[PDB]
Symmetry: C2
Subunit: 302 residues, 2 copies
């Protein structure tokens, strides 16, 4: 009665993966050349979708992306398009009952174009329906459509530049203390509803490069919170993403690195000092983290 095959003669795939590039933040469309096979090369071919196809987050039902489908140069929907028989330009030369090749295109993207897709595994179906002249001289081809957006987290300077791998704290010889390093930062994330968990991988210390026993503690605060080896969580809501501004980038958070003696009033031993702040930023429950080692130096001059 009616069927739709690859232009080969091969059966259409039951399933289809749409390759994602993190670089361009798009899915590559699935593109196949097809032919209609029929007994009846005189009736209008009526092409529709059985429902509106959606890629849906396989772990979360609120997170959707519209699938687009075209066939024969025509955007398909739940409303049927009719192709005149003569247009599909059937052969009966020696393959009798087979249309010219028509491209099937399966595309996906976010519902608001220009915005990035959420981290996740996505699943849906394209139910393609072809009839002659209505009735049920009918075929349904279902194609499973899956995609994958790998969870991703970056920490950048608020200007988009990489964080310094090396930082120098000035010493005030009057107050006997250090001037704090302060850099404005933003988290760039795929998964903007998840907690951000921030720790230090180890307790940081400035060490006298000539005297292994002369340490002074470093203090690190981020986003207004004093950090340590014990993880502190930041609710996504208290970080200031927007669903209508700079999508998937937090508001500016101040990174603050300082140093002082363990006890106030101590005269810091004259010398050059060094140490490494290891900053760990983890995406809630996505198995993704970013790690920044920052070398911290200082000189104590009398």
């Amino acid at each position: 009665m009616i069927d739709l095959l690859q232009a080969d003669g091969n059966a259409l795939p039951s399933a289809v993966k749409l390759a994602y590039s993190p670089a361009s933040k798009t899915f590559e469309s699935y593109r196949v050349m097809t032919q209609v096979h029929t007994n009846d090369a005189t009736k209008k071919v009526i092409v529709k979708l059985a429902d509106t196809p959606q890629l849906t987050d396989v772990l979360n039902s609120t997170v959707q992306m519209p699938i687009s489908v075209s066939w024969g140069g025509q955007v398909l929907s739940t409303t049927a398009k009719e192709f005149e028989a003569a247009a599909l330009g059937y052969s009966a030369s020696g393959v009798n009952g087979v249309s010219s090749s028509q491209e099937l295109v399966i595309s996906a993207a976010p519902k608001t174009a220009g915005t990035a897709p959420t981290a996740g595994n996505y699943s849906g179906v394209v139910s393609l329906v072809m009839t002659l002249g209505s009735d049920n001289k009918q075929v349904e081809k279902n194609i499973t459509v899956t995609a994958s957006v790998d969870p991703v987290i970056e920490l950048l300077q608020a200007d988009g530049n990489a964080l310094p791998s090396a930082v120098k704290l000035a010493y005030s010889p009057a107050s006997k203390t250090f001037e704090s390093y302060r850099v404005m930062t933003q988290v760039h994330t795929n998964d903007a509803t998840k907690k951000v968990i921030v720790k230090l991988a180890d307790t940081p210390q400035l060490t006298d490069v000539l005297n292994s026993t002369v340490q002074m503690p470093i203090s690190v605060s981020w986003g207004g919170q004093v950090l340590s080896t014990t993880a502190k969580e930041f609710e996504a809501a208290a970080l200031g993403y927007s669903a209508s501004g700079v999508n998937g980038v937090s508001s500016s958070q101040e990174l603050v690195i300082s140093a002082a003696p363990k006890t106030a009033g101590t005269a810091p031993t004259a010398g050059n000092y060094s140490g490494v702040v290891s900053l760990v930023m983890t995406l809630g429950s996505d198995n993704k983290q970013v790690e920044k080692n920052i070398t911290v130096t200082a000189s104590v001059d009398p």
Copy 2:
């Protein structure tokens, strides 16, 4: 009694320009090798600044950037540092009171680290003070420091992708219309107080790819407003910049590209159409413009296709 010249023997410049790197968002330091001339090559040289030097925006005095000044390896402040004469390592071999060469580093950075500075012209003075034995006698060398932060404007997709080079408009045979292309865009600028001026460079048409006479008009709207070859102004405050969000970036602005057939109610001629939208965005009163040329395609399919 005490003065400071270049290592050559030439006088210090009265003025110095800081080249700004747009890529790294910082300034190329001015570095000059200097020698101290004196009558008393055996004393403490006391080196200090008269004032705290700022680069200040020359059309706005609330926009400031700190100057750093070093000499001999030491960062200088309004508090004086002493240099032991022995340390400056003076000659009297046939130059009778002249130091070993010691480098003057004039630098500046943005007010807040990790933040791009505003487009503008900045001016300040380094008022370098040197003293013999911290007594009655001294020398002031003033160096004017200017820097320029060049205006920049980029138009991007809201996710930070580039705009597409190419756009395909679907045709609906039932309503006899095109489905509009929509994309969310943001303006990135360092000159965030200026008007953004938006026009089309040419009046855009979908033309039949094989016949020039057969054409349909392309409509373009950005940020709610229909674009033409006449420029339209958008006030900076309307575009929803923030002094404390993602700085230098507008709120999202929808670009909408459509086409209508030449006469309403009439099926466009069957065939394949192509044309260019040349979108020009200009920063108000600056030079700096961005142009995005988008190719707009369309396949028309009437009578052949129904409902």
